Write a protein that binds this ligand. Sequence first.
Ligand SMILES: *Cc1c(COP(=O)(O)O)cnc(C)c1O
Ligand SMILES: *Cc1c(COP(=O)(O)O)cnc(C)c1O
Ligand SMILES: [Cl-]
Ligand SMILES: [Cl-]
Ligand SMILES: [Cl-]
Lengths: 388, 388
Amino acid sequence: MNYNFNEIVDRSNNFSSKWSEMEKKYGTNDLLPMWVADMDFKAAPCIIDSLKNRLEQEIYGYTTRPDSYNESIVNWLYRRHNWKIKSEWLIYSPGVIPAISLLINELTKANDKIMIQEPVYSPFNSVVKNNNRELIISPLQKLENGNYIMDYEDIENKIKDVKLFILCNPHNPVGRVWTKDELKKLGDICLKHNVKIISDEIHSDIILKKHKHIPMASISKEFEKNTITCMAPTKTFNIAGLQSSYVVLPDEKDYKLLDDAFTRIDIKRNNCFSLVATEASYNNGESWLESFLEYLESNIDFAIKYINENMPKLKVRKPEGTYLLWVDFSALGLSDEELESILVQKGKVALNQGNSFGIGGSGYQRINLACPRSMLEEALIRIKNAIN
Amino acid sequence: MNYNFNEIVDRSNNFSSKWSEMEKKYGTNDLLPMWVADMDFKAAPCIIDSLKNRLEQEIYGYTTRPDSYNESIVNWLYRRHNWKIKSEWLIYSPGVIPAISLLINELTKANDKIMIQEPVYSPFNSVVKNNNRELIISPLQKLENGNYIMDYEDIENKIKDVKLFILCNPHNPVGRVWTKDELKKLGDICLKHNVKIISDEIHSDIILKKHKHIPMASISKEFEKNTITCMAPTKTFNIAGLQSSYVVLPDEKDYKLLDDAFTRIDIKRNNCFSLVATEASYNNGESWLESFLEYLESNIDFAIKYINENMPKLKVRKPEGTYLLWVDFSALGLSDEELESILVQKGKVALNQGNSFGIGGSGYQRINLACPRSMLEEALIRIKNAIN
Ligand SMILES: *Cc1c(COP(=O)(O)O)cnc(C)c1O
Ligand SMILES: *Cc1c(COP(=O)(O)O)cnc(C)c1O
Ligand SMILES: [Cl-]
Ligand SMILES: [Cl-]
Ligand SMILES: [Cl-]
């Protein structure tokens, strides 16, 4: 199946933050954007048509969540991940960080310790601080072979009095898809220390060849009981603007706490478009997704070949998942400030600064590869210009 | 201008809570729905076409809020209400109650007292309780002429240590459009006792002939500084399914507190459809709104004539605003439970039970008149069957 991912789709009129909010961040908007994790691709045709059908009803009042909605999510998790859940475990949230934010408030008290692994998605750090909890960072270990693993010894050394661990699986920005054995080793630590895991698995569908997503909660019943899982159609199908995610809570007590938190802030219903797009994506979007992954892996291979051939001082490992590339610029001898400056000023390209991801980010930049080949090539040429 | 409000638009396929969620509330879904406050009318043509234009871009990623969005709001409030605000005062919220819930958490501490006037929109009561604050109720006074007013003596008597007053303007369900002098008397009390006012003005556009909405914050500079205001296009234009509302905070310290609460729960962006519909509704929807208000007032006059002629034991005062009719059934001598039973079982009609609005609701039912004349007639015939 072919969906014309090579097509240029200008988003200058698309009310896109990727294309329109670069001034606050970079000091100008006149840059090639490769930062924000959404895609410069059209949504799957089944999504577009589900929106069309809903639009053409012409009444946009309060929206009910039919059984078919959560059924689509149960069926997806089983057929894609071999993880059987119950529809009764699912809670709607407009996004992952909102859900994690309410969980932190309900599952811990002020100044309780919460652990994350850096470098990681920057909201993980801020959500803990903005809830007045104490952030404990166990940095991932970058091995001398250039790859990242969890630092299990460090996690043990820092685990005392920790109440929650936020796991990123696949891990953004480094692109790790954790193996079952890696997950088992972490989940055993947390079981032993009575630490509940919140697993952010939003990139669960964006997995490259020869890798497989394992939901942490899927590994065993003991892990299931000790893991809360956040997933969404939004990264997979490029529908973050529609606002749809879910939380899987196999423990009733946790379910009740989160449900009651959403009741307290009165955030319960999907918007009318999110509702139909989420079901359409999971029920009909598989073919588009497989095609997208083939296109993505080709972009990834192209970018790494380009960098190794044309920018050999840069260092990059191929990600196992996500569409995000994590590139080490440190051999240039520039400070993070100097590098940010040349990329913006000389390259005229917008990448996510490594240091924004916390410990272990210095010297790196994150590049979004979910864009047409031609745009990716332009981006790489601009980076080449920046550093030469 | 004519928009064919007479047209039947079956919503059995429209994922509508009004048409689809009666089972949990009433015991069956086989009822004529006149309960939930959304309309059985198509959205304005300008709103449908804005949604079509956005849909046809075919990319639905993270959405930026262009200056034109808050400009449309500022211009509406001046044109319609003669209230000049600054765009810098506006905060996005997916809904009014979410905003109020965050305001309560940030402006008060646990077990602080918050005052409301019943009977009122039931989330006013629950939002205080679900935030572990203490609810103080000053019931509206029902005068011997059948009209409602504020009980200013009661408010004074119960004011000590109240931190916040949640005002509904217009007041759902009784249909009061408070006069400037009524609002001055309240706001003077609150200023005097250092009680901040949160004014829910979501029905601010749904105003009948010979009445005028007065934003509480618009009355004086001193009231502007002591009033936070929630408004939305959703009730006005029947777009609750798109999720859009705003808060007006003229005091920068209040702005910051709410801003930071939204940051804490990571709810910052409009969904892509809400963004375009809100600007379209305010910029282009005025002619539709004036036509809808003519249609509504005719429905209201028809219903009151029908009730007075055919169900003379019932008592009803014409509302000044909202599309909601507040009808007293107490002369039938039924308990609230008995009345609900006969309306559902015998009438097969779904109204909002009066007692759900708190003190002063017993014996009443609320009827939604934002529907075609034909459907309204059918609803009144069902009610007459129920009570005979
Ligand atoms: C992009 C992203 C999210 C998105 O969070 P929302 O609150 O749904 O927008 C969450 N987690 C990770 C790891 C991400 O990369
Ligand atoms: C219907 C209604 C609302 C709607 O609140 P949201 O949280 O925006 O859905 C708010 N206030 C009043 C008085 C209402 O009648
Ligand atoms: Cl180089
Ligand atoms: Cl009077
Ligand atoms: Cl009668």
